[PDB]
Design an enzyme around this catalytic site. Structure first.
Site, PDB file in Angstrom:
ATOM      1  CD  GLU A 151       4.870   1.962 -10.296  1.00  0.00           C
ATOM      2  OE1 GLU A 151       5.364   0.890 -10.738  1.00  0.00           O
ATOM      3  OE2 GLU A 151       3.625   2.224 -10.320  1.00  0.00           O
ATOM      4  N   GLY A 285       9.646  -7.112  -7.205  1.00  0.00           N
ATOM      5  CA  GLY A 285       9.651  -8.349  -7.963  1.00  0.00           C
ATOM      6  C   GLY A 285      10.095  -8.109  -9.388  1.00  0.00           C
ATOM      7  CB  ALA A 286       9.341  -7.609 -12.321  1.00  0.00           C
ATOM      8  CG  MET A 287       9.760  -0.811 -12.647  1.00  0.00           C
ATOM      9  SD  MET A 287       8.109  -0.326 -12.086  1.00  0.00           S
ATOM     10  CE  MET A 287       7.755   1.093 -13.077  1.00  0.00           C
ATOM     11  CD  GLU A 288       4.122  -0.392 -14.674  1.00  0.00           C
ATOM     12  OE1 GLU A 288       3.634  -0.050 -15.778  1.00  0.00           O
ATOM     13  OE2 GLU A 288       3.621  -0.102 -13.572  1.00  0.00           O
ATOM     14  CG  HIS A 321       1.775  -8.258 -12.780  1.00  0.00           C
ATOM     15  ND1 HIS A 321       0.675  -8.331 -11.957  1.00  0.00           N
ATOM     16  CD2 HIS A 321       2.324  -7.046 -12.558  1.00  0.00           C
ATOM     17  CE1 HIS A 321       0.563  -7.210 -11.267  1.00  0.00           C
ATOM     18  NE2 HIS A 321       1.560  -6.417 -11.606  1.00  0.00           N
ATOM     19  CD  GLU A 322       6.120  -6.222 -13.886  1.00  0.00           C
ATOM     20  OE1 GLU A 322       6.738  -6.181 -12.813  1.00  0.00           O
ATOM     21  OE2 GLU A 322       5.383  -5.291 -14.265  1.00  0.00           O
TER      22      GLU A 322
HETATM   23  C1  LIG Z   1       3.316  -4.603  -4.536  1.00  0.00           C
HETATM   24  C2  LIG Z   1       4.517  -3.869  -3.911  1.00  0.00           C
HETATM   25  C3  LIG Z   1       5.060  -4.578  -2.716  1.00  0.00           C
HETATM   26  C4  LIG Z   1       5.602  -3.210  -4.700  1.00  0.00           C
HETATM   27  C5  LIG Z   1       6.554  -4.164  -5.473  1.00  0.00           C
HETATM   28  N1  LIG Z   1       5.705  -4.817  -6.451  1.00  0.00           N
HETATM   29  C6  LIG Z   1       6.187  -5.893  -7.294  1.00  0.00           C
HETATM   30  O1  LIG Z   1       7.328  -6.322  -7.193  1.00  0.00           O
HETATM   31  C7  LIG Z   1       5.239  -6.402  -8.293  1.00  0.00           C
HETATM   32  C8  LIG Z   1       5.264  -7.872  -8.346  1.00  0.00           C
HETATM   33  C9  LIG Z   1       5.083  -8.398  -6.935  1.00  0.00           C
HETATM   34  C10 LIG Z   1       3.904  -8.079  -6.206  1.00  0.00           C
HETATM   35  C11 LIG Z   1       3.751  -8.572  -4.909  1.00  0.00           C
HETATM   36  C12 LIG Z   1       2.497  -8.151  -4.150  1.00  0.00           C
HETATM   37  C13 LIG Z   1       1.302  -7.848  -4.804  1.00  0.00           C
HETATM   38  C14 LIG Z   1       0.206  -7.414  -4.060  1.00  0.00           C
HETATM   39  C15 LIG Z   1       0.321  -7.250  -2.679  1.00  0.00           C
HETATM   40  C16 LIG Z   1       1.524  -7.519  -2.029  1.00  0.00           C
HETATM   41  C17 LIG Z   1       2.620  -7.953  -2.777  1.00  0.00           C
HETATM   42  C18 LIG Z   1       4.756  -9.359  -4.316  1.00  0.00           C
HETATM   43  C19 LIG Z   1       5.928  -9.653  -5.061  1.00  0.00           C
HETATM   44  C20 LIG Z   1       7.093 -10.500  -4.529  1.00  0.00           C
HETATM   45  C21 LIG Z   1       6.903 -11.789  -3.981  1.00  0.00           C
HETATM   46  C22 LIG Z   1       8.024 -12.484  -3.524  1.00  0.00           C
HETATM   47  C23 LIG Z   1       9.295 -11.913  -3.623  1.00  0.00           C
HETATM   48  C24 LIG Z   1       9.466 -10.628  -4.178  1.00  0.00           C
HETATM   49  C25 LIG Z   1       8.355  -9.937  -4.627  1.00  0.00           C
HETATM   50  C26 LIG Z   1       6.085  -9.167  -6.363  1.00  0.00           C
HETATM   51  C27 LIG Z   1       5.655  -5.837  -9.654  1.00  0.00           C
HETATM   52  P1  LIG Z   1       4.578  -4.523 -10.415  1.00  0.00           P
HETATM   53  O2  LIG Z   1       3.321  -4.354  -9.641  1.00  0.00           O
HETATM   54  O3  LIG Z   1       4.258  -5.003 -11.858  1.00  0.00           O
HETATM   55  C28 LIG Z   1       5.576  -2.986 -10.450  1.00  0.00           C
HETATM   56  N2  LIG Z   1       5.168  -2.287 -11.620  1.00  0.00           N
HETATM   57  C29 LIG Z   1       5.429  -2.209  -9.153  1.00  0.00           C
HETATM   58  C30 LIG Z   1       6.624  -1.330  -8.756  1.00  0.00           C
HETATM   59  C31 LIG Z   1       6.761  -0.752  -7.326  1.00  0.00           C
HETATM   60  C32 LIG Z   1       5.828   0.210  -6.847  1.00  0.00           C
HETATM   61  C33 LIG Z   1       5.953   0.763  -5.548  1.00  0.00           C
HETATM   62  C34 LIG Z   1       7.008   0.355  -4.734  1.00  0.00           C
HETATM   63  C35 LIG Z   1       7.950  -0.596  -5.217  1.00  0.00           C
HETATM   64  C36 LIG Z   1       7.832  -1.119  -6.530  1.00  0.00           C
HETATM   65  C37 LIG Z   1       7.315  -5.005  -4.559  1.00  0.00           C
HETATM   66  N3  LIG Z   1       8.282  -4.381  -3.755  1.00  0.00           N
HETATM   67  O4  LIG Z   1       6.950  -6.173  -4.310  1.00  0.00           O
END
Ligand SMILES: CC(C)C[C@H](NC(=O)[C@H](Cc1cc(-c2ccccc2)cc(-c2ccccc2)c1)CP(=O)(O)[C@@H](N)CCc1ccccc1)C(N)=O
Ligand SMILES: *[C@@H]1O[C@H](CO)[C@@H](O[C@@H]2O[C@H](CO)[C@@H](O[C@@H]3O[C@H](CO[C@H]4O[C@H](CO)[C@@H](O)[C@H](O)[C@@H]4O)[C@@H](O)[C@H](O[C@H]4O[C@H](CO)[C@@H](O)[C@H](O)[C@@H]4O)[C@@H]3O)[C@H](O)[C@H]2NC(C)=O)[C@H](O)[C@H]1NC(C)=O
Ligand SMILES: CC(C)C[C@H](NC(=O)[C@H](Cc1cc(-c2ccccc2)cc(-c2ccccc2)c1)CP(=O)(O)[C@@H](N)CCc1ccccc1)C(N)=O
Ligand SMILES: *[C@@H]1O[C@H](CO)[C@@H](O[C@@H]2O[C@H](CO)[C@@H](O[C@@H]3O[C@H](CO)[C@@H](O)[C@H](O)[C@@H]3O)[C@H](O)[C@H]2NC(C)=O)[C@H](O)[C@H]1NC(C)=O
Ligand SMILES: *[C@@H]1O[C@H](CO)[C@@H](O[C@@H]2O[C@H](CO)[C@@H](O)[C@H](O)[C@H]2NC(C)=O)[C@H](O)[C@H]1NC(C)=O
Ligand SMILES: *[C@@H]1O[C@H](CO)[C@@H](O[C@@H]2O[C@H](CO)[C@@H](O)[C@H](O)[C@H]2NC(C)=O)[C@H](O)[C@H]1NC(C)=O
Ligand SMILES: *[C@@H]1O[C@H](CO)[C@@H](O)[C@H](O)[C@H]1NC(C)=O
Lengths: 872, 916
Positions: A151, A285-288, A321-322
């Site tokens: 993603e 953080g994780a991925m759905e 969430h996931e």
């Molecule tokens: C949100 C962004 C940054 C992408 C990615 N989001 C995730 O990790 C989420 C869970 C999550 C969210 C956040 C968070 C939410 C809102 C606004 C700022 C931040 C912080 C964390 C976090 C906190 C501490 C340490 C590590 C992580 C975790 C999994 P999700 O939304 O269920 C997946 N389906 C989305 C996949 C994705 C999309 C686009 C780019 C990268 C990945 C990522 N890097 O934090």
């Protein structure tokens, strides 16, 4: 004619826009991967059954960093391209990450042709696409695994595809592997066929229709723990072998939550298995991924000797969430990244429901208020954005994954759950999914389904989803409901010539809702000025009940001053902190002053109220100690200890009691020796050195670990012992807290050695680098080192990360968003204009620019007031 | 006993024995050893049952044991019914200062009866690369894997299982191992059968060994791959390596088959085991270890890859393989009684490298290199701090000090001398009778000489028998026994007298006056300490000599300190020590040296090629001896313009190359700059004939590298620009283009002079899959000129992660010998001595060369001062080593050489630039 771009072979590329053409449509991907985990490369083949519908002389799809060796176009119907088919000219145009398949004939509509391709590449080293990850074992062997993360625009780096979420298809997947590895993917494995060389090939059941960005496959050496959900689904929690002990809470918690979602949505999870795996070097953080959910280890695995109640709370939120995404995003997904909040807004909202109705002990409802608050900080500046908004480039789509899409999505959803009532809401949610199962929904479609549970609600939410910002409620004489709305801002007062922007079209159909007794009154506010009549007159009158609405309340006269400083339980606990929260942003905003700012209650028992307001005091200390003036810092320090000495001394240094109990302890003792208040900092040191002299034999209670470690950093004999033991530990939770514990030291070189090992990436994994920086830059001692370092090694950090990455986003606002000077504001105006030298534009530029600008103007006209609280 | 005041065991408890040697009343016969290691918990669990035979009645058994937790210990017998099954529990007493344990007997045991001692013990897997330890390697993918390895010589078997850890206590060993699915287990002997167990663990049983000393026991748990083949005698030779390196074991297999076959014909004794395994251990301290049927090597000692391994590398791998295989006879089939006679192993294996490699791989021309083995030991044997071949030794670090240049090199050299005296076939049959008559037992020094003395030349088995069955009393049969006895007294003296004899001959008409004295560098013949060290030294020296007039080798034994022979018709010169097969220096008094140098200068080819390298070696030594002026030694180097025998050429060249480095350390730049100019001018012809790819003979290849390194060490712009291009292309092609192996080291050095090349080389070090290439890169990194880079390498080796600690001492040694790092290495060692001692035992080879490698090149009175004071500091803390004296004498004789000869060297060079 020649108005198009040059390909890499010097021919002109037949397509000119970043969105793909709509004429060719995929239906089915057959996909073969043959990764090699010693060669760190892969070979792969692919057949796409794409149905044409309009005349076309060229197929267009995405590919990045892949070497395409063979490309054939067969057809069963239009048998000009009958078996063996014809060989296709393949053009490549990287600036749109697209390739053109030039058919020699012309395709003719309504027929099905079959695109086959052979392609190959090295496993990524950037933690995106199909990439290589390592992990350590108990004996210190390191083993390798090959993971996918797609993603949102990265599946095109693993196989050529139509990589937009609207192009749903079926995906049969086969994977060849060595005997010492297992292969996992979205679906369960049908069969395993042994081959000539001693290799195995695993076939997987075809998927339902889904977007490319959910395709997953892993090759690794993991064990699992398994259980069955009521429905008929097998849930497996995979992890590294020496950590299978740590998977227990996740299987428990996953079982409940998926049980919950199936009944709550009234739709069965449509796969036979759901697997959750703890990828050791993982950027998100994780991925759905459908059926194969990848977690950071700190997001999934729980060791009760090593993990906070707060860490148990974090694990259970991410495993809500996931799972929620399995419906919001996998079952129903946005047609395009502009309505990305449809997945993320709903996922972050569903987590609050699920954990609350599955784990009441953890008390998540009282915590949820924070998430709107965080988005309100962003949403209150002019740098913010409407929840839905166009998005074309890759890094611009990655910008859409922010706290506006998650938090504010989740909160305006929370507003409407209050108004229409959970009954009508839940029925609407279920109609929304069941209608749009295995398809794609636009922003409008959700509300047009939600409304029919009332054509009124659609343009109400138009005010919320298509417009930037957060409304402000101005209430003004007995039965005086003289309502007037504005656009709440900060750093721009009514005085200023900048304030004319508070008037553009900024009109919210706010669904205001009040009480002046234990009963709530509900009424819409669709105009700049409208009003009501008070039934009888009362002491106070409060609108924002529990802050369940996305607006701040400002009483224009003689209402604030009552607050009940004697009996506080007149006003309910959530409204308690709702009022606390509103009475600081109104201070920054420009209406109220700081003298009533510190108004608030040493006999407040709901810790939500207690921590929220005191966390507000933490910010004042830190912001002032960061510019090194003790003239206002020392008064803030022992004020908080003396006044909050009873509560602080009460806490018992052990992980006992309930969850808000346990969180209040670590939160409280945090300050307790972040202030060198000997009674407890002295306490730590004997536990610390009892453990350090026990050498892993003594057990420290959970909720104090980050504190103890942090305390004993300063002695280099400790800091060196903590770093050394970091490597040895088998708990990613425990080693995270150590890693914080080493960011606390005030030695400029010891701090930078940590940063040097992050850049290297072997002892401290690169997934942690941004957070490591972000911790350091928060201390005043290392604040400028980090800022210096980022500007010195920028181009190298940018080789690590994608720049729309979260790590890049967290590094710059982690190093700069805490500044309050005019000095740094120009110096950050430079180097932002220095990086638009290259083609590097990020909205976080202006968000942080305006955020230090709002830090100046909150000292410019508000600190003189707060020197005025010397006590004695 | 009577007197309580004995050693005190670790639980109170007076301990009932107090010598460090073991008592010989109890004799082990057969060890039943079960080992169960775990490679994810890094510890092991074991059990053991020793069948012992009691000789005199005791109340206690004394065993070796170090760092082993013993949990319980029974005693049983089936000849003595008091300890009838299940026997009795024994009290265990630990005296961990003798590394001994005592098992306490409840009822005193009976003579002539066999008992069974059984202990359970456990320990963590070793960390010091001795005992039963943990090692790791890196794969192609970047994974890290663990293996468990034994290394016991000389006295570490006691750190893996309690035992009678002395070489004479031979026994049979029955070994069972227990392991997971993913690992193989190897031991000395083949695997008989693999039983599966509940839980999925497997247990391997190995065939029980023949009688064997403890230090050769071996067992390994790993996941290596193997290539295999069979010898003529039907032995299964297998080469084991980490799986991504199977490629690199082909040459090893080819050579070990050939060498084994050679050894079985030459010794006329088969290798007695069914299989022979050679395994390349990645983190390996010794280099090679000759465990019976499972021989461990450093990767550099065993693996060969043609894209990156030099020809020198190829020669090295053949030597080591040849060396280890020799040990299966000399050392395993026949073991020395005790470590004082360790040269019975290492001297013969060292010598047998020459015979085997020369017999199976003549293309390597190892016969022409063999002279250097004797020159290297004459360095130290010409100092007082030298020791006789066989000296007493008692403590563990005292034992290991016996593995030196004397045990190996001198042992090889005097053997070679003796072989030339008796003739190859007499010498072979002496060896064969010795190995056959001590098979499966031990021997001492006197035993070797008595067998080699009484050797029979195969026509002594004729019809008229001269050795066996029925001899005729002939007059040669009176000379046989008189000559045999003469050989025995002669060899006896060469092993008991330290030092090396100097035969000075003055030719007088056609008389020849012979004299012998101890050779001594440093000290002059006019020194106040010189008659005090000519004490009692006198050798029986079988001499050799040719003439200007006749090329017939004449041979006469001198046992008399002065003696004289007469020649037929006075020729233009005589040349003693033909081919330099003799362990002695020959000084020509009067006109002898000019006659020989005059000969070399006009028609040098009448002197036999080895006569020439011997003559070059002999006079530079005699300059150090005070008997010759540096004048005529340098005057001999003219004539190397015509010298075509690369051995003589290279000997002469390297004396001049070392003078240059000697000056460059001292910053005596006017001589150093002149030495640069003389070498580049006078050997310009042969330097530019050299190709920059590895195309000729092995000597042609070795000479190519030699000369090109020299020309590139003298910053000869033509050769350095060539190497800089080659390096630049290699870097520009992603480290993917190929450099010829014979010039690979030179190119990586020139590249390492820039911070770019240096950094690129350092990242390629971590990624390379050839440990020969890694060796070359590490040398090149060590040629850096920035003190920051050098220090980084050193500290990298201290931490042991990217640079494995097994290479740390060679790393320091590399840095110290070059001027810009000489000082840094010295400061590191003194400021980290306590830190170096935690990684390496005080008697380890690693500590020996860290000390000698950072100090032995010093040549000033100021530096001698600091070294004495540092050595004194060390021995004040209880650390004594013989290396301390050897370094001090070496430093002072360097100082003396400068004082007597540095003026003449400057003068000579300037004279030569005026002539040419
Ligand atoms: C949100 C962004 C940054 C992408 C990615 N989001 C995730 O990790 C989420 C869970 C999550 C969210 C956040 C968070 C939410 C809102 C606004 C700022 C931040 C912080 C964390 C976090 C906190 C501490 C340490 C590590 C992580 C975790 C999994 P999700 O939304 O269920 C997946 N389906 C989305 C996949 C994705 C999309 C686009 C780019 C990268 C990945 C990522 N890097 O934090
Ligand atoms: C990722 O890539 C890695 C490395 O490229 C692959 O690992 C290699 O795979 C190859 C091919 O399977 C392996 O090579 C094979 O080794 C077999 C075992 O050799 C030992 O045992 C035999 C039988 O006792 C001995 O003869 C031999 O000397 C060794 O003792 C061989 O049997 C194989 O030979 C076969 O192919 C040859 C080709 O010439 C035929 O001539 C033979 O008759 C026979 O049919 C072959 O050589 C190699 O061992 C692997 N390397 C490692 C480090 O394990 C992975 O397979 C690959 N993974 C994926 C998922 O693609
Ligand atoms: C020499 C001692 C310390 C042990 C060990 N010698 C060996 O490796 C030999 C081969 C060998 C010998 C030498 C060497 C000879 C003469 C004088 C100094 C040194 C150097 C090397 C060498 C070359 C390059 C890099 C590293 C090493 C190799 C195998 P070997 O003789 O058949 C087995 N018998 C020895 C077993 C052993 C005995 C005692 C202590 C430790 C081990 C070692 N560390 O150099
Ligand atoms: C311990 O190791 C020694 C080797 O040092 C083993 O000695 C060998 O024992 C075998 C079997 O007893 C002998 O083979 C036999 O020899 C006779 C000839 O008398 C022959 O008729 C038999 O059929 C068989 O070939 C072998 O000669 C002997 N070798 C030596 C050097 O003694 C001993 O067996 C081992 N002990 C145990 C318990 O394993
Ligand atoms: C086939 O494609 C043609 C060309 O794209 C289609 O004609 C377009 O149809 C869209 C549909 O909204 C119209 O807006 C445009 O006026 C047409 N031309 C272009 C250039 O867009 C046609 O409808 C497609 N479908 C068929 C033929 O079934
Ligand atoms: C592609 O996915 C779709 C949707 O998941 C599959 O459609 C289902 O097929 C099953 C079995 O034929 C039917 O019981 C359902 O009624 C279908 N669901 C829908 C929503 O249509 C389709 O079978 C998949 N295609 C392949 C080739 O596996
Ligand atoms: C503030 O004062 C401290 C006192 O130690 C000093 O070390 C620090 O560098 C100062 N900070 C700034 C930004 O000048």
């Amino acid at each position: 004619p020649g108005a198009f771009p040059v390909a890499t072979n010097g021919e002109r590329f037949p397509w000119q826009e970043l969105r793909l053409p709509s004429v060719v449509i995929p239906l089915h991907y057959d996909l073969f991967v043959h990764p090699n985990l010693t060669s760190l490369d892969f070979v792969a083949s692919e057949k796409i059954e794409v149905l044409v519908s309009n005349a076309t002389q060229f197929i267009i799809l995405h590919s990045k960093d892949l070497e395409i060796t063979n490309a054939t176009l067969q057809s069963e119907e239009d048998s000009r391209y009958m078996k063996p088919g014809k060989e296709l000219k393949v053009l490549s145009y990287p600036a749109h990450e697209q390739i053109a398949l030039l058919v020699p004939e012309k395709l003719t509509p309504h027929l099905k042709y079959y695109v086959a391709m052979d392609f190959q590449a090295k496993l990524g080293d950037g933690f995106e696409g199909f990439y290589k990850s390592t992990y350590r074992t108990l004996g210190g062997e390191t083993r390798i695994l090959a993971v996918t993360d797609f993603e949102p625009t990265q599946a095109r780096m693993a196989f050529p595809c139509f990589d937009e979420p609207l192009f749903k298809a079926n995906f049969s997947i086969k994977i060849r592997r060595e005997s010492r590895h297992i292969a996992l993917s979205n679906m369960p494995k049908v069969k395993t066929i042994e081959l000539e060389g001693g290799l195995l090939e695993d076939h997987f059941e075809t998927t339902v229709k889904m977007s490319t960005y959910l395709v997953a496959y892993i090759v690794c050496d993991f064990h699992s723990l398994s259980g069955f959900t009521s429905s008929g689904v097998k849930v497996s929690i995979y992890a590294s072998p020496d950590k299978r002990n740590q998977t227990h809470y996740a299987l428990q918690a996953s079982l409940k939550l998926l049980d919950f979602y199936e009944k709550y949505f009234d739709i069965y999870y449509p796969l036979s298995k759901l697997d959750l795996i703890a990828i050791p070097d993982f950027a998100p953080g994780a991925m759905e991924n459908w059926g194969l959910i990848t977690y950071r280890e700190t997001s999934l695995l729980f060791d009760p000797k090593t993990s906070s109640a707060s860490d148990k709370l974090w694990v259970t939120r991410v495993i809500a969430h996931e799972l929620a995404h399995q419906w919001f995003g996998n079952l129903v997904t946005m047609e395009w990244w502009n309505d990305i909040w449809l997945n993320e807004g709903f996922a972050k909202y569903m987590e609050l429901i699920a954990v609350n109705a599955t784990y009441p002990e953890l008390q998540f409802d009282d915590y949820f208020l924070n998430v709107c608050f965080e988005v309100i900080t962003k949403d209150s500046l002019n740098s913010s954005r409407p929840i839905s908004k166009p998005a074309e480039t890759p890094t611009q789509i990655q910008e859409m994954f922010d706290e506006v899409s998650y938090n504010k999505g989740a909160c305006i959803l929370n507003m409407l759950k209050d108004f229409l009532g959970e009954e009508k809401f839940q029925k609407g949610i279920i109609q929304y999914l069941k209608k749009f199962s295995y398809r794609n929904a636009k922003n409008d479609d959700l509300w047009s389904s939600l409304s029919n549970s009332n054509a009124e609600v659609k343009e109400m939410m138009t005010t919320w989803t298509l417009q930037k910002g957060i409304p402000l409620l101005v209430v003004k004489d007995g039965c005086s409901l003289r309502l007037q709305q504005e656009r709440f801002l900060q750093g721009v007062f009514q005085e200023d010539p900048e304030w004319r922007a508070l008037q553009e079209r900024y009109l919210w159909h706010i669904p205001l809702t009040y009480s002046s007794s234990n009963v709530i009154h509900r009424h819409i506010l669709k105009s700049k000025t409208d009003t009501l009549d008070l039934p009888e007159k009362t002491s106070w009158v409060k609108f924002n009940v529990d802050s369940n609405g996305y607006y701040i309340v400002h009483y224009e006269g003689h209402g604030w001053d009552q607050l009940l400083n004697q009996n506080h339980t007149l006003l309910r606990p959530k409204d308690r902190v709702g009022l606390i929260h509103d009475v600081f942003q109104l201070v920054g905003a420009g209406r109220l002053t700081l003298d009533k700012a510190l108004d608030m209650l040493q006999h407040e028992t709901s810790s939500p109220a207690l921590l929220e307001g005191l966390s507000y005091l933490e910010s004042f200390y830190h912001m002032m100690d960061r510019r090194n003036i003790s003239d206002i810092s020392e008064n803030l320090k022992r004020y908080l200890l003396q006044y909050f000495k009873p509560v602080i001394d009460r806490q018992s240094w052990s992980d006992k009691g309930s969850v808000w109990d346990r969180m209040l302890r670590s939160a409280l003792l945090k300050l307790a020796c972040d202030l060198n208040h000997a009674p407890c900092i002295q306490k730590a040191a004997e536990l610390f050195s009892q453990w350090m002299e026990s050498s892993g034999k003594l057990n420290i209670p959970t909720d104090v670990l980050k504190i103890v470690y942090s305390v004993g950093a300063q002695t280099t004999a400790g800091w060196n012992y903590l770093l050394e033991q970091y490597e040895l530990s088998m708990s990613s939770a425990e080693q995270n807290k150590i890693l914080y514990a080493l960011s606390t030291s005030k030695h400029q070189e010891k701090l930078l050695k940590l940063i040097e090992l992050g850049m290297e990436g072997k002892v401290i994994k690169t997934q942690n680098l941004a957070a490591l920086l972000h911790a350091i830059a928060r201390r005043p001692k290392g604040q400028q080192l980090a800022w210096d370092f980022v500007r010195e090694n920028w181009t190298h950090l940018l080789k690590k990360f994608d720049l729309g990455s979260y790590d890049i986003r967290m590094i710059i606002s982690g190093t700069t968003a805490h500044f309050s000077s005019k000095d740094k504001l120009q110096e950050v105006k430079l180097f932002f204009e220095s990086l638009e030298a290259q083609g590097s534009h990020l909205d976080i530029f202006q968000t942080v620019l305006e955020t230090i600008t709002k830090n100046i103007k909150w000292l410019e006209k508000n600190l003189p007031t707060l020197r005025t609280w010397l006590m004695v």
